[PDB]
Every structure is written in C-alpha cells, then in structure tokens.
Amino acid sequence: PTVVVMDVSLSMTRPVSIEGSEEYQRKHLAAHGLTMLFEHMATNYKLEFTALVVFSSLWELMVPFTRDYNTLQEALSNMDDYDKTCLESALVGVCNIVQQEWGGAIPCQVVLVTDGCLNRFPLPFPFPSKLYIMCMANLEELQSTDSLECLERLIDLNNGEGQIFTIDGPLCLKNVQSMFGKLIDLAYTPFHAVLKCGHLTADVQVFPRPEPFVVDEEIDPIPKVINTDLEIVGFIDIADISSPPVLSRHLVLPIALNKEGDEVENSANQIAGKIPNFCVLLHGSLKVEGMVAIVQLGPEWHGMLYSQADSKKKSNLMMSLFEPGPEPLPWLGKMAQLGPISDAKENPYGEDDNKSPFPLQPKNKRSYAQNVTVWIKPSGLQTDVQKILRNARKLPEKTQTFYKELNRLRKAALAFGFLDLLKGVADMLERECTLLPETAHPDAAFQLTHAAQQLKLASTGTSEYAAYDQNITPLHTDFSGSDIGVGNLIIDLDA
Amino acid sequence: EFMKIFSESHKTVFVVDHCPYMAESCRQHVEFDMLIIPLAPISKSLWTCSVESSMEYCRIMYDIFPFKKLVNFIVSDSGAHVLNSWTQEDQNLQELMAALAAVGPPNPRADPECCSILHGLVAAVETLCKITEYQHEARTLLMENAERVGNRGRIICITNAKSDSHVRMLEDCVQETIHEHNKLAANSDHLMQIQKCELVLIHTYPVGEDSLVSDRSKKELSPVLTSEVHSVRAGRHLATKLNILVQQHFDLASTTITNIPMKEEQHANTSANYDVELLHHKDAHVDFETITLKWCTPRTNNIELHYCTGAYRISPVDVNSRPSSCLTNFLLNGRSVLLEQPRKSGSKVISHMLSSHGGEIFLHVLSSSRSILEDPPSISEGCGGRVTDYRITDFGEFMRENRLTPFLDPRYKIDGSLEVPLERAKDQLEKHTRYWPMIISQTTIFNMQAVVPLASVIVKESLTEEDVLNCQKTIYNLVDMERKNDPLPISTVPKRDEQYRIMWNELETLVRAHINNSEKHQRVLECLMACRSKP
Numbered sequence A: 001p002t003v004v005v006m007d008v009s010l011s012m013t014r015p016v017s018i019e020g021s022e023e024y025q026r027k028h029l030a031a032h033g034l035t036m037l038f039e040h041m042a043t044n045y046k047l048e049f050t051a052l053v054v055f056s057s058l059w060e061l062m063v064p065f066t067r068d069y070n071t072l073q074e075a076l077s078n079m080d081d082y083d084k085t086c087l088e089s090a091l092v093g094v095c096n097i098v099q100q101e102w103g104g105a106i107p108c109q110v111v112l113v114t115d116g117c118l119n120r121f122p123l124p125f126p127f128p129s130k131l132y133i134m135c136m137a138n139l140e141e142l143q144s145t146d147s148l149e150c151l152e153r154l155i156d157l158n159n160g161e162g163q164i165f166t167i168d169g170p171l172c173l174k175n176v177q178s179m180f181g182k183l184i185d186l187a188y189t190p191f192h193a194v195l196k197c198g199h200l201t202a203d204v205q206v207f208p209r210p211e212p213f214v215v216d217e218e219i220d221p222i223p224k225v226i227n228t229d230l231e232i233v234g235f236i237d238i239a240d241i242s243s244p245p246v247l248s249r250h251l252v253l254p255i256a257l258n259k260e261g262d263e264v265e266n267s268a269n270q271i272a273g274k275i276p277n278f279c280v281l282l283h284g285s286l287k288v289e290g291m292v293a294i295v296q297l298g299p300e301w302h303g304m305l306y307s308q309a310d311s312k313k314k315s316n317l318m319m320s321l322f323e324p325g326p327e328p329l330p331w332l333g334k335m336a337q338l339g340p341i342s343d344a345k346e347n348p349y350g351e352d353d354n355k356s357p358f359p360l361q362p363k364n365k366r367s368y369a370q371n372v373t374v375w376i377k378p379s380g381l382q383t384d385v386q387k388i389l390r391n392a393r394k395l396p397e398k399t400q401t402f403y404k405e406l407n408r409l410r411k412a413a414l415a416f417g418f419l420d421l422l423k424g425v426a427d428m429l430e431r432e433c434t435l436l437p438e439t440a441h442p443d444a445a446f447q448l449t450h451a452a453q454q455l456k457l458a459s460t461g462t463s464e465y466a467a468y469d470q471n472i473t474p475l476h477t478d479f480s481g482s483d484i485g486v487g488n489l490i491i492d493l494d495a
Numbered sequence B: 001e002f003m004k005i006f007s008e009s010h011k012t013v014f015v016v017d018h019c020p021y022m023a024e025s026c027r028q029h030v031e032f033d034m035l036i037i038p039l040a041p042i043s044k045s046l047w048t049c050s051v052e053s054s055m056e057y058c059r060i061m062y063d064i065f066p067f068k069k070l071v072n073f074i075v076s077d078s079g080a081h082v083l084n085s086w087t088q089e090d091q092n093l094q095e096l097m098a099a100l101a102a103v104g105p106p107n108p109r110a111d112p113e114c115c116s117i118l119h120g121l122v123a124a125v126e127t128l129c130k131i132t133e134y135q136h137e138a139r140t141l142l143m144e145n146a147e148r149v150g151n152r153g154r155i156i157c158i159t160n161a162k163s164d165s166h167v168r169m170l171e172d173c174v175q176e177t178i179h180e181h182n183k184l185a186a187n188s189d190h191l192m193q194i195q196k197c198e199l200v201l202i203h204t205y206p207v208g209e210d211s212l213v214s215d216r217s218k219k220e221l222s223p224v225l226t227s228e229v230h231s232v233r234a235g236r237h238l239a240t241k242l243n244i245l246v247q248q249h250f251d252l253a254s255t256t257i258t259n260i261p262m263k264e265e266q267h268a269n270t271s272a273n274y275d276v277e278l279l280h281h282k283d284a285h286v287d288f289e290t291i292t293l294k295w296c297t298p299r300t301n302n303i304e305l306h307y308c309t310g311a312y313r314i315s316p317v318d319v320n321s322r323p324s325s326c327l328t329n330f331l332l333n334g335r336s337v338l339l340e341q342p343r344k345s346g347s348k349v350i351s352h353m354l355s356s357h358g359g360e361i362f363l364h365v366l367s368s369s370r371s372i373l374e375d376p377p378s379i380s381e382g383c384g385g386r387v388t389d390y391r392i393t394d395f396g397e398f399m400r401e402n403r404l405t406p407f408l409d410p411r412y413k414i415d416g417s418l419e420v421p422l423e424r425a426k427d428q429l430e431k432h433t434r435y436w437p438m439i440i441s442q443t444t445i446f447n448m449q450a451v452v453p454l455a456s457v458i459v460k461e462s463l464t465e466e467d468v469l470n471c472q473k474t475i476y477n478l479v480d481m482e483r484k485n486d487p488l489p490i491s492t493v494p495k496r497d498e499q500y501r502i503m504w505n506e507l508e509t510l511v512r513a514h515i516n517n518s519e520k521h522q523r524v525l526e527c528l529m530a531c532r533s534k535p
C-alpha cells in the first residue's frame, strides 16, 4: 500500500515563480505530480491500495485506502477546503492508518508532498516502509533555510529507507513531472515474469512486486530476487502442502505483450480475451484438483502457485514464496529430492490414489509422541501410580501393560535416583495382593507379589534388577482354565 | 567476531553436584497414594530434584529446537563425568536417563576423597572449547576467509553451596579456568576459544531451611564471562526456576489454549472446558506473561490451504497431564485446530492454527488483517478469459500424473548416470508438454478415446515392448475407424476425408515430437506413416 501525505499549509499557496514564468502555486504542481502518479497507478499498478492524508495545523484522512484512482484524483481539487480534525503528527496518523488496515508486516510506501517550510516518535515506521519526500521547493530554496537538512533527517530516522526528491532548477511543471516520473520508476514499476510449465508459457505480472530478500547479512548477504522465468517443477496435493509458512503472497496475472515488450484500450483486452492463456488453464485445474504447483524461484529457492481456497471469494492465480534454502518444509523433505512418480518403485499415492508419501516424519520423536516420565508435579506421579494399579487389579488379562507400566516406573526411578518411590510402590502392590477379592484369577496374586518383590530388590541398588536394562518379567504360571473418572480425556465435539 | 545461530544457545553445559550431601531430603513430601492406612509420604533427594528440573529443561528445549541447540550434561563428585557429547546424535533424552541411572544416587555414607563441584566446572569450561559439528561445518565453509565463527556457551550449575563467600570462589575458579584454557584453545587447531560464556549458579536447599546463599544479579566478571546466582528451594521452586530459565535462554513465550471442550468417553456429565499451556519461540506472537488463544471448535467444512506467515514448533508445559495429552493426540491423529485472539471488538479474529506434521506439532501464524490481494481481477476479464473450452479436467490429470514424491538419496542412477530427482521431474514436464493443446477445439486426437493408449506412453523416454504393441494397436484401430468412416471430434467448440487427414497429421505431429527419445519411438512413427492415408 501507499499513503500520500499532502501538505495543505499556507506556504503551499506561494507561487512557484515570482518571475511569473508559470501561474501555479506550490499546491498546484503538487496536484499535478500526484495526478501523474495516480494515472500511472490506475493503468500500470491497478491493484495497489492508496490512501490520501492532508495536513496543516491538523491532519485528516481524506481518502481511505482505495484502488479507485478516480476518487483519489478527484480528491486533489477539493483538498485545500477539507476539514482536518486530528491533532497528532500526521506521521502518527500514517502509522495508525497503515496498521489498522494491513497490520504491521506489509510493506507500505509513504509519499510526503511538501515545500519543507520550517511518547514514541513515528519514525522509523513500525512496518516495512519507504519514506519518499517530494519537495515542492527547489534545492536552492531548501538550502537557503536549512530545511533540506531536516527533511534529510527524516530519511535518516527511517534508517535511510526512502529518498528525498528535489529539483535543482526552476520549480516548473516539466521539472515536477520529471520528479514524479523518477518516483514512479523507482517505486511503482510492475514486476514482469514468464510462467512456465515445460513448454506451456504465459507472460505475467507478479503483484505486488516481491521485495528483495537478504538471508544472513554475515553468512549470505546478497539480496535475492526471484528468477523471471518461473519454472513449475511439479505438483503437490493441498493436503500434503498443509498450510506452509511463506514469506509473502502475490497475484500472478497474464499480460498482453507486443514485439517491443509492450503491454498493449477498450479493444485490446477484447482480442486478448479470445487468445487461450496458460494462466487460466493452470488456475482452473489447480482449483478443481485442489493442488499447488511447486515453482523454482532460484537456485535452492522454491514457492508454490495455487488458487484461492475460500470458495466464497473471487479466485485467481496466486503465488507464495517459501523461505530460501534446500528444505524449507520438513514434511516434504529436501526440495531437490522431490522427484517424479515414474521414477519410484511402487506408486507412492496408491493403486487407487488413496495413499500419500507425505508427510515425512522427523528422525526422532518429540516428547508428546512418545512416552516420557515427568514427576515434578505430584499429579504426574499419582497418575503413573494409579495407572499401574488400575492394571494390577485386572490380572491376568492385562499383565502386558501391567509390566510395561511397572518397568517404566522402575527405569525412571533409577534414572532420577528416586529409590524411595520403588519401595513405596512395591508396598502398594503387596497391599493390593492382600486386598484381592476371592473371585480373582489365581494368577493375580502370584504376579502382584513377584512384582512387589522385584521392585523392592531394585530399591536395594545392590546390582540386582537395579540395572537399567533388567526388566521385571511376569512369572510363567500354568493356570489351565477360564475407567471411572481416571480414564482418558477426549474432545467433546458437541456444543 | 559474529554469532549467528552460534550464540550462547548453541552450547549449554549442565553441571549437577553428585557429592554425598546431595542425597539429603528436599523435605517436600509427595502423596503417591490417593485413597485403610495410606502409605508413608516420601520425598526426593536434592540430587533427584536437580536431575528432574534439568531434564525437563532439556525436554522443552529438545522439542522446540530438535536441531542446532546442544547440551553436554556433566555430573561432578570426586571427578567429572560427561554423560554425552556435542554431536546431535548424542542429544537424546533417553540415553541421558540411562547415564543418570548408571551414576546413580549419591552415596550418603561415602567419603569420596577430593570431591567438589569444581571438577565439573572445569570440565564445563573444557568442553565449551571442543568444536561442535555445526561449528566445525561453519569453519570449514567460511574458510580462512572467516573462521571468525563465534563460540559462546552457557554453564548451568546446580549445587548446594556453603556461603556467599563459597559461591564467589567458584566464580573466580571458572574465571581463571576460562582464561588459562583459552590460551590452549588458541594454539590448538581442534579447539576454539570461548568468546563469551554465561554462568548460572543455582543454589538449591531443602524446604524449611533458610539458604546461606543469596541471589546475586548478573555481573561481568571477565570480558568473556558473565555470572549470576540464584537461591531457590528444592522441589517445585527449583522446577519453576528452570522453567523460567529455559524461556529466557531460548527466547520462548507461553500460549495457553483456553476453552477446550473435553469429556470422558465412559461418563455422561463429564462435559467440561479445559486449558492447556504451550511453549514455543517468541516469534509466534510478533503479529500480536501467558498469551491466551481461545479454542475454536472445528467445522469439517473449513479451508484446506491457509495463508501462513510462520510456523513454530511447540512443547506442552504439562506433557503428561490429562488435558494436554488430549489436545496433543487430537492433533497427532491428524486434526487441526484454529485459535481465536480474544477481542471485545466483536469481529472474531482467527490469529493461529495448531497442526501436527508427521508427528511434530507446529503453531501456524495466520493473517488477521485485510489482504492486499483481496478482490482480484476476474479471470473472465483478463487474457484468455473469453475462451470457453479449456481442457481443465485433462490438465488436472496432467497434474495428478506429475505429483512429486520424496526420494531418499540426493541422487539415483538412471542410465548408469546419477540424476537429481527434482531435475528429472522438471524434465518429465518438458516431455509431457511438447504437444499439449490447451483447448478442446484445437485438437482432434486428444478428444479421442481410441488414441489414449498411444498418447499416454509415446511421451515416455523409452517404451516397453507392451508399450509398442499398444501404440501399433491404436494406429491399427484408427485405420479401422477411417475405413468405417466413423465421425471424428474436430467439431465446433470439414469433409470426413479431410477429418482423417487432419487427425493423422496431428497424430504424426505428436509422434514426431518424440522420435528422438528412443529407437522404438522411431518405429512407432514408421508404423503410423505406413498405415495412415496420404494425400
């Protein structure tokens, strides 16, 4: 986005030429320069949002962020007589305006039009920003009053992000046009690329123009720009890409070019509309198939093309850029090792297209995907205790989990050096054996005391079952013949 | 010199005291018997408290940072024992639990000659000078064009100190040891000097006593060494301290997911709302001391592809608690859950998503703000948008047939030559698009079921003997169709004589596009040329 900050103070009513070379006041060349900017936007950068703020004693937002460059254009003739109400710095207003719409991660350009006449300070802007100052005063005038050094400080406070534009010469219309022309070339020229899928190609614009990325000012300082040949290398199902983190998102839109590289009117998009275009084919298929197209942005840099996923909005073709590098998404693995199905032994996606090779899993399990023992909270000890008891009662049906739970508590107790716990459990177990009901399978008592005895021998530490590897086994007894509140919690998908 | 990921986080050294005094009781009783005469409430050794707190710190770190954040765990009694190394392989909690079990609890009735925490403090300073694998990799890549890779570490020491005087002697011993050993690391090629070290001295003592050690704020002892001192009771206070410390050492924030509706499957009135607290890198809250995000109940008609500006691994605070284990396994079983940032604004704000990927749970940062790409131009108003007959479903099959799949090695042989998987994918797209008309009215053969057996294999780089037969059989059938004068789909989207001439010309165009692939391709064309009708 762009916020135009337009000075409507009295000084701007001064003539551009006391010699009468031209009749304009400063505000008139300012509006002429902005008209040039809005006209360029309206035809070569249509998707850009622009707001218009005016300021003198006070400031006011006159036009909220819009793509309607007519309303922005019409605002220029009516901006001196617009009621300003707000009483902070207009640059404070710019900050509030920008984040209130786009948040604080979106690059905004702030175009300050003025003659220069001379809590958290607003600069540097809290979002990625350029501050472009269009001086409606010439260099000799700015120098003659130290106003030039103030303006130059603003760029310094915005960490040199932005530029002062000045005229060293007569403040006339040709020179102001030349000046806004330089701003246009610097900050509003579309980014043109070629979208390729093998031999299928389309000339496209990538909007907004992606910002040049720097990885690590020490380890890799060269700014990265995406290749202009956007080569599709393969397709991946939306469910496998699984909402990856990306640097930024862009519309990818076809453009009608001429022999001279000329984007070509009330009749030109008519004949362009009847020429089949690979963007439309790709976009439509991507939506219908629910897929993304993986695209190479440069050596070891990839991204994806896809269609709008909310079905209630307009859709068109979009591109997100991944973080540069050889493995941005763990679950896909290294991009360069993604290959064609034809080269695989079996079809990874299944004979009935019901499987997927994705996601890859990490080499080692995280702790929530794997049993871990944590006894800092007394709740966490009790639950491991009640777990061992719940199964101790259900013997011999559950000797497996009984002895799995039991050996877990044994191993953790030896790791932590919590040997008192071993005697304590062993005592609970032998109480259970005592308290057993006379309907119990006879094997329950043999296992409970054998467990309670082996657990106390591990308290001894005296290299018995005290060894970490030495698990407690059930007795091989030859019997030949015939959760309430402490169970798992589940997710209540009602209400 | 610089630190990138080679800050102090890279190398953390634990030094826990294993001297006989550590066997004393923290005196914080534990109730291991919930519901006759309950058993005697037991208590942990100061040693056990220290090993618990340090292992939980290591769990949280290992979840949030499974790579490039390393730990050496050292126990000190009469000597130092380093239970693992810097290698990422040796960064395994389970192997540590085994090592700790093998050193065992301190012997109260032992008199190990010349035992003190100082043995391990030296060992800490020594291993900080051994190169990690990532350090060794960066030196070998940065060449002598740098080899200014930073080497900074942290030493966390849990002990029972005697007095404030005693603690200061330890600082000075570390201070001199870093100074003397750095000289060795200098004239050593296999060792790196310590450019900065942070020392955390944690004095822990049983509940009920008044510590003889007082907290001392961070102090710069050395150009290399900074040092701080905490007094904290053993048990839950020591545990809380290392939880605060893990968040500070690794730039973590806390998020509690609120209002998770849960219940017990074997109950009725069990329906209830629960809260779970997660740790992750602080960057997850940049767009926005715990941040609350409200659970949003999943609608099965949800968006499949979300715009995500970042994804951060999590570790649950209470990993074995019942409500966290519920949230965790829900995610692990494939479900995703959207999170709302509470605002009395009214406009509900979905700021985050929780999703597991191959068993690893990420917190995805979503977009709450208006999109600069909103209201895009209409496809119909742009280039080619007045074209009605795009081969969309045919091209979707193209996509399904060119889905990517991960291969294990960086390369694999094809014709005795090693190829890059993604290169071979890109090459296949080239072959599949040498002849691929985008719209129905521009093709005859791709509207014909009879041509599929040929068109679907002729683009391969070699043909099986079965592939060849099906190619000839397709051609033979087209001769039969022409003889029966079957109508062909060249229609609006003339003379049948012309229909077939056109159809054959297009089939020849397709085949000729591939005769350089293989000699069998060449023979398919000879068959076509011989069986088709020529003007």
Ligand SMILES: [Mg+2]
Pocket (backbone or CB within 6 Å): A009, A010, A011, A012, A116, A117
């Ligand atoms: Mg003024």
